[PDB]
Amino acid sequence: SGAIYVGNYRVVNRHLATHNDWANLVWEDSSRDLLVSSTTAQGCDTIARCDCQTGVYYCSSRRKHYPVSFSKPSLIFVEASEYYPARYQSHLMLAVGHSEPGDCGGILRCQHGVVGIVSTGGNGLVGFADVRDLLWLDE
Ligand SMILES: Cn1cc2c(n1)CCC[C@@H]2C(=O)N1CCC[C@H](C(N)=O)C1
Ligand SMILES: [Zn+2]
Numbered sequence: 001s002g003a004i005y006v007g008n009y010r011v012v013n014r015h016l017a018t019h020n021d022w023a024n025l026v027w028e029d030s031s032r033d034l035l036v037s038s039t040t041a042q043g044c045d046t047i048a049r050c051d052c053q054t055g056v057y058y059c060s061s062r063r064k065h066y067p068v069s070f071s072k073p074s075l076i077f078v079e080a081s082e083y084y085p086a087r088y089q090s091h092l093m094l095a096v097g098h099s100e101p102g103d104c105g106g107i108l109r110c111q112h113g114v115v116g117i118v119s120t121g122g123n124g125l126v127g128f129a130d131v132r133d134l135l136w137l138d139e
Contacts, residue, residue, distance in 0.1 A: 011117070091129060
């Protein structure tokens, strides 16, 4: 689990979205595994607007933060799951690291702020859904 809270927006993994997230839907993209819903309270997370390829992510399955080097956002093929059939997921960055399904939602941060959230894994690689291109989260 895990979400990004900025302004009157809440960003979650689309596969983990609640009934309330869907009832207050702002935008969703199945290909990115992202869903943004509206909130009453104001959020204070700062979104990075950069092209950093190094950062730190939170891994609940180990109760630890790990420094990582990650790839640039791209179309990477993701094996079938109970949430989606086999497809290419867009805007995805990979890093050598540990992850488990329950780690989805953990934030990846660089020195500029929030970069994205944990979204895929397997084969000793962790996938992060990038959020830096969503400039509308700040206005
Ligand atoms: C963080 N994490 C996620 C996973 C693992 N860690 C390890 C096992 C694979 C699993 C995974 O890659 N998927 C299951 C959840 C939905 C994902 C998606 N966005 O399409 C695909
Ligand atoms: Zn950065």
